[PDB]
Amino acid sequence: IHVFLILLNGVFFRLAPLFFFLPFLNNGIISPSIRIPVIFLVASGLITSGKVDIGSSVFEHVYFLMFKEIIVGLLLSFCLSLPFWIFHAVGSIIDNQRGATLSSSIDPANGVDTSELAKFFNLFSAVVFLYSGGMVFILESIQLSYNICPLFSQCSFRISNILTFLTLLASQAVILASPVMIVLLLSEVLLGVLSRFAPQMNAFSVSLTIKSLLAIFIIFICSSTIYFSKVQFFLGEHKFFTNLF
Amino acid sequence: LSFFTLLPFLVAAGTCYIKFSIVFVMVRNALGLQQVPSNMTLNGIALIMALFVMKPIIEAGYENYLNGPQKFDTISDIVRFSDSGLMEYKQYLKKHTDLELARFFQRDYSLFSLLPAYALSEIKDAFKIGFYLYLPFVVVDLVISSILLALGMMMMSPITISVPIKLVLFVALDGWGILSKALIEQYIN
Amino acid sequence: IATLSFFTLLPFLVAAGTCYIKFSIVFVMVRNALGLQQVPSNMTLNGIALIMALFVMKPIIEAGYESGLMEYKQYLKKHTDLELARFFQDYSLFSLLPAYALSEIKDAFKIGFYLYLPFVVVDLVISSILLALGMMMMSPITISVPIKLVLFVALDGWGILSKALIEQYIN
Amino acid sequence: ATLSFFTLLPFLVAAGTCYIKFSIVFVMVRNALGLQQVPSNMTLNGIALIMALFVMKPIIEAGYELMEYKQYLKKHTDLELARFFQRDYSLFSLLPAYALSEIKDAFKIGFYLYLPFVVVDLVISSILLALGMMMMSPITISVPIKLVLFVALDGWGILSKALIEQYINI
Amino acid sequence: ATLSFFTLLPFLVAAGTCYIKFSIVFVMVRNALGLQQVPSNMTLNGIALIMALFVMKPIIEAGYELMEYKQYLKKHTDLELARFFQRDYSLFSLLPAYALSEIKDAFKIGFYLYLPFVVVDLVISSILLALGMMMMSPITISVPIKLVLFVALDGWGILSKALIEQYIN
Amino acid sequence: ATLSFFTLLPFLVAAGTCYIKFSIVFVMVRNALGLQQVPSNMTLNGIALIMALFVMKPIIEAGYELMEYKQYLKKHTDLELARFFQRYSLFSLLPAYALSEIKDAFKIGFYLYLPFVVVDLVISSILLALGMMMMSPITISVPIKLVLFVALDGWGILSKALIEQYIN
Amino acid sequence: MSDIVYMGNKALYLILIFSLWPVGIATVIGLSIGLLQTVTQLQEQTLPFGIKLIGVSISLLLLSGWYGEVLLSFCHEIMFLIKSG
Amino acid sequence: MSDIVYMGNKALYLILIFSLWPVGIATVIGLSIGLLQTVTQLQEQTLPFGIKLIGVSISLLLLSGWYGEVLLSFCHEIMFLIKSG
Amino acid sequence: MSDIVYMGNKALYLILIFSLWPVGIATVIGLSIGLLQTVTQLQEQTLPFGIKLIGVSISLLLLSGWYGEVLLSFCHEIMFLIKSG
Amino acid sequence: MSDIVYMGNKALYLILIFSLWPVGIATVIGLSIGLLQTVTQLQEQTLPFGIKLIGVSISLLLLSGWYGEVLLSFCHEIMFLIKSG
């Protein structure tokens, strides 16, 4: 047992960035005495189920495949955690719409950074993902990453598709927010009309009062657009991450 | 100094520790309390509770460890001890691991190919339960935020004010007692 | 491996089985009560709580240092809930640790809610008198900390708090 | 001496590589929209991290298999500022000069794009005051108009496509 | 067991030395001046540790030769609160009383110097509401005035001279 | 004794080196511009650490074989403040140096924190004179507070004027 | 995953049914005394927090018992969902 | 848990008592100087803050002794309850 | 705790004194230009910041020494209270 | 701190100097059409803002060179003082 562990760190530093920013294995929700043994169990389960490929490899390659796997395993983490980062987006552009974290939208020092509705959506979508083939899909996505550039390959990955990532994450977030956001703006423009026809009121306070509750009411009568983006995302991460490399 | 150090965590990975040591950590993050039920405290409470759950597994496996004879210190004999020397923790693993995730660590199961499947199954299940616990602490959190923005005051954060209400909701619930009872009755019937 | 496998688990047995729980959930909640997020410096409060827990555990430590402890066992059946120690079941040691730990977490949250509360009253008062005055945009965390400290030094503060919190264990 | 290896590696990637240029421009676009959370800080510090590691990929692959990295420093450092620290070159007298050159260029290129957002903010505020009403906050109206006009202008795609082409041939 | 020697030594420093008195006061000065990030919190832990180790220096090298540190503890411990943790003196009966007395004293000396900054914050808030506007947060405008009121005081020099003369005659 | 040193290596860096002088200033420049998130505080720790270790280079590369370190402390300590801790030994040069550079870094930061709030109040003044009140001038004031900083050669002349006190 | 949808819509219903009463009283009082800052000219954007604060007090202190019991009878239902499978 | 209920209702009572006086004086001065912003033209929202600021000093520097004592007589009783089990 | 009570009372006194001048000058200049909202057509809720902005500056640019000196000599008094007991 | 007296009082000087013109042109042209809000029937606060946005801008487009040579020279003075202690 000397060659057993040189294959073990190469799977560690591919899968340890998969737990960092995957918001049901790290929002500070598992202890740092759990991350290291959970990865040393999952990695030991992967390299005895035969889900690797020989590179016939030593004499310059201890820290050399370190920086390799971080450029690969992060790319596995990023297209795998796209929906949660939409819902953690779609919480924010709902509660910064109604003014929850509008305290820190002026002086970002002593107010709200990680708010109270975005954490609710970020756990709720993690649960809805996690029932519907949660850890199976992630772990076969790890073997799909192993199908392309296992741990000894060159990983000369295609460029211009990880640069459209963040506009994908913005486009889906604004489109998915669109039933909530435009009615809040219709309400606030209508109350601006009311402030024009009565130029003495506090339009800001009266705007906040109705415009928080109306947002939480519109999130309630949705019932439809919560789960069915993840079949799209199943086919998506089978397609995108295949054509990223 | 890793196998000298992380072996009390590798062994305590995939017994029952994960199942508690997320949920308590997910109850602390649910109350708005960012640090105060200290991490080195809650990872101790979860450890002693999980070792209580594992004690009738541990001594009755140590009986099979002790009578033996079980010549050791090689690869094949420890694999033989993992099935024909334990025989009841493996049934404990088969009880709580998914019939669709333990098949992933394969090519009538063994032992070493269920511990990652068991660890991820408990991360899955503990995250389910921790979301159900998080779920009535955001009704109070969003009610306080809504009636606090509705009462003019926007700049003051509800993280300061909600914690008395998120604890008068929680100690009157009986709190860690009814939670730990309802969470340990899954493992001790 | 025994000289590190017994040392790695030992902070968990101090912060899980001793009286440390009862202080480490209170004092770090005193800090978050005042609005101060960092300044009493968690490295420090986990030292105050640890030496004050070692002061309580000291007649247990030197007695058991000489079925081995048996005064720690009798210590556990004094702050454990009676209707919760019957759920984790003569008695033992390790069937008595988790009932004690859960009992002190529940009692420490009750103590913490008692003292988190005479500060949120003055926090909401400063916010109300600072909105009705008009100055809506300024955060009252700047103004509220002097009043939440003059309200706490006039209490005599940490002295009478640790007195009233250690009288349950030493009397 | 591998304790100083992993510890000083965030203090070398965020200080000596191209992570400065992206970690400032991205978080400067986010703060311009008013919405300072919806791309997360953990999100932007992952996009900028892989966008910096892909630029550092041929440099590390050529160097560890340091003269290639010094060519990368000398190409992008201001010569008017690198000569001050040398009072050819050495390595360690360029990383402060390179880091300050990238911070100055980051604020320069970030300010060149921060400007069409404040003019649409002033457009929204001016058309709100021109329609009588004044006593309403136009930040909350302007923020989704600063989103849906930024997403439909292809946004981060047209941004970061020419923010790494300054450092690579794509 | 040199690890249990060493894993408690930060608890002996932050609990039994004079590190409490500076690690509360300095770290509260950062919170006092509005900007709660600026002197790089680990920096203030550095300054407070080197100053507390300076104060403990005639106990540190005079311990490597023990009835010279408890006599330090008896000087700054409360008279009546050390008697509560008693029932001469002993060891493991003063460090709680010493630590609680210096936390109380640190909050007192902290509230003394916290106070001439909330007055200038409320002054700036009042002149900024009286100047028509409401929406601009005065945390921005407060910080340069809260620093011109601090640097012109001689600042950290006169503060640490006022704060360390209690422990050195 | 090999883990008794790395537990105090960052304390000697952030308390005894030139790091203080930069890590107060640049973090204050981030807070000065009104954009108090974007230069990514670990980045500023990186810039300040490499720029401080550049000054420490003739001290470390002559100290690996200390006397020039004590000379470095005696050069950058106030006359009117080293006398107090003196009432030679290493532990009495450290706190006077650390407090001297905290006071000097707050002075240097105050000199530069000041030409930004004047343009902040200019933008607030022209915003209220132009009718509008409910819109905060933070978002509108950021680009002007930064174009005032780019046209000052950015961070170049700032770091030159901040490091020339240490390289004669 | 029916339990998640039912608990999530029940939480978003409890937020609405709790926050409908005091936020509704707050916006009725704010809009109404804004209408008294119309034709009887009393143009001050400093008034209504003096009156909204009492309504949100009275409509909470009258109703804080109910805020307990359903939200406690809610919190036990969830407990059954973790005494189940 | 009835002690928790009594302490919580006493806290809501102390918030409402301590914010009846100065918020009430502030809104009474605001409404009463809005009465001078009636037919006697004073249509500027500046003079209320010039006078409300002194009121919530005068109703707060005269009265803060009482704000001490009851709020300290509260803070001892809580300490009494944690002198118990 | 008479030192603490004296420092707190002097703090409220310094708030009231240091804000009595510029708020008073601001509202006097505002009401003085509001006397031109008589029969002369000057109904604008935008004009007085055109003058009030100079007034708050003039009673502070000409008065920054006083705002210095006592508020600096106050900061020495506190220092005395922490140099002594 | 004697140079801080000179640098600090020059900060309030530039608040007076650099904001005299753009507020002043705003309170002249905004008062010029405010003088067209006299007996001339143009009672709007809608068209006397689009003339004020363009009224400030001509005093902000042409006069912006006065903001350049001396506010940088004010910052070149500051950069010269910090080369000393």
GROMACS .gro file of C-alpha atoms in nm, chain E residues 40-147:
model
  108
  815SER     CA    1  -0.726   4.346   0.994
  816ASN     CA    2  -0.859   4.168   1.306
  817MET     CA    3  -0.565   3.925   1.321
  818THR     CA    4  -0.343   4.237   1.335
  819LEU     CA    5  -0.517   4.356   1.653
  820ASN     CA    6  -0.479   4.010   1.800
  821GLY     CA    7  -0.109   4.042   1.715
  822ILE     CA    8  -0.067   4.380   1.883
  823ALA     CA    9  -0.266   4.272   2.189
  824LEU     CA   10  -0.064   3.951   2.220
  825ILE     CA   11   0.277   4.118   2.191
  826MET     CA   12   0.172   4.384   2.442
  827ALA     CA   13   0.033   4.130   2.689
  828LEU     CA   14   0.346   3.919   2.650
  829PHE     CA   15   0.550   4.234   2.717
  830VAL     CA   16   0.353   4.279   3.040
  831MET     CA   17   0.397   3.913   3.134
  832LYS     CA   18   0.774   3.922   3.055
  833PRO     CA   19   0.887   3.971   3.421
  834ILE     CA   20   0.672   3.667   3.509
  835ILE     CA   21   0.774   3.469   3.201
  836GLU     CA   22   1.149   3.475   3.254
  837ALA     CA   23   1.105   3.474   3.631
  838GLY     CA   24   0.910   3.150   3.604
  839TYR     CA   25   1.193   2.968   3.426
  840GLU     CA   26   1.428   2.951   3.724
  841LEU     CA   27   0.555   3.037   4.077
  842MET     CA   28   0.476   3.260   4.376
  843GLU     CA   29   0.526   3.560   4.147
  844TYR     CA   30   0.227   3.520   3.911
  845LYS     CA   31  -0.040   3.467   4.176
  846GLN     CA   32   0.079   3.790   4.337
  847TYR     CA   33   0.018   3.951   3.999
  848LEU     CA   34  -0.331   3.800   3.997
  849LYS     CA   35  -0.417   3.929   4.346
  850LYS     CA   36  -0.342   4.288   4.241
  851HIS     CA   37  -0.607   4.312   3.966
  852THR     CA   38  -0.865   4.066   4.097
  853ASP     CA   39  -1.175   4.204   4.266
  854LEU     CA   40  -1.166   4.180   4.644
  855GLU     CA   41  -1.519   4.045   4.695
  856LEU     CA   42  -1.541   3.837   4.378
  857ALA     CA   43  -1.225   3.642   4.454
  858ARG     CA   44  -1.390   3.552   4.784
  859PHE     CA   45  -1.687   3.407   4.596
  860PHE     CA   46  -1.458   3.172   4.403
  861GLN     CA   47  -1.278   3.072   4.723
  862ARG     CA   48  -1.545   2.890   4.925
  863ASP     CA   49  -0.406   3.337   5.174
  864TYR     CA   50  -0.551   3.217   4.842
  865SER     CA   51  -0.486   2.927   4.605
  866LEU     CA   52  -0.461   2.832   4.238
  867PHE     CA   53  -0.760   2.744   4.016
  868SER     CA   54  -0.956   2.983   4.235
  869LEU     CA   55  -0.831   3.319   4.102
  870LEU     CA   56  -0.820   3.278   3.723
  871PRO     CA   57  -1.203   3.278   3.696
  872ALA     CA   58  -1.215   3.576   3.930
  873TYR     CA   59  -0.926   3.748   3.752
  874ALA     CA   60  -1.072   3.682   3.408
  875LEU     CA   61  -1.422   3.799   3.500
  876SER     CA   62  -1.282   4.107   3.673
  877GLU     CA   63  -1.081   4.203   3.366
  878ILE     CA   64  -1.373   4.138   3.131
  879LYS     CA   65  -1.586   4.369   3.350
  880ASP     CA   66  -1.305   4.625   3.364
  881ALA     CA   67  -1.248   4.595   2.989
  882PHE     CA   68  -1.614   4.664   2.915
  883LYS     CA   69  -1.601   4.961   3.154
  884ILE     CA   70  -1.285   5.114   3.002
  885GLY     CA   71  -1.430   5.025   2.664
  886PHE     CA   72  -1.756   5.210   2.725
  887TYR     CA   73  -1.556   5.515   2.835
  888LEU     CA   74  -1.390   5.540   2.494
  889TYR     CA   75  -1.680   5.404   2.290
  890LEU     CA   76  -1.886   5.704   2.398
  891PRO     CA   77  -1.705   6.005   2.233
  892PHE     CA   78  -1.776   5.848   1.891
  893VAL     CA   79  -2.149   5.785   1.907
  894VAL     CA   80  -2.189   6.154   1.992
  895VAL     CA   81  -2.017   6.253   1.667
  896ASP     CA   82  -2.214   5.990   1.475
  897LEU     CA   83  -2.540   6.134   1.607
  898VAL     CA   84  -2.415   6.488   1.534
  899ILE     CA   85  -2.346   6.394   1.172
  900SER     CA   86  -2.683   6.220   1.145
  901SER     CA   87  -2.858   6.528   1.284
  902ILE     CA   88  -2.684   6.775   1.053
  903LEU     CA   89  -2.746   6.542   0.760
  904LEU     CA   90  -3.119   6.513   0.828
  905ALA     CA   91  -3.136   6.889   0.882
  906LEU     CA   92  -2.964   6.935   0.543
  907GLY     CA   93  -3.274   6.822   0.354
  908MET     CA   94  -3.161   6.470   0.268
  909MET     CA   95  -3.265   6.145   0.433
  910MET     CA   96  -3.142   5.861   0.216
  911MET     CA   97  -2.762   5.896   0.230
  912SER     CA   98  -2.633   5.676   0.510
  913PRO     CA   99  -2.416   5.881   0.749
  914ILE     CA  100  -2.187   5.584   0.819
  915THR     CA  101  -1.983   5.705   0.521
  916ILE     CA  102  -1.950   6.066   0.638
  917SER     CA  103  -1.898   5.965   1.001
  918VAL     CA  104  -1.571   5.776   0.944
  919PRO     CA  105  -1.339   6.066   0.841
  920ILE     CA  106  -1.472   6.280   1.123
  921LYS     CA  107  -1.447   5.986   1.365
  922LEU     CA  108  -1.083   5.959   1.257
   0.00000   0.00000   0.00000
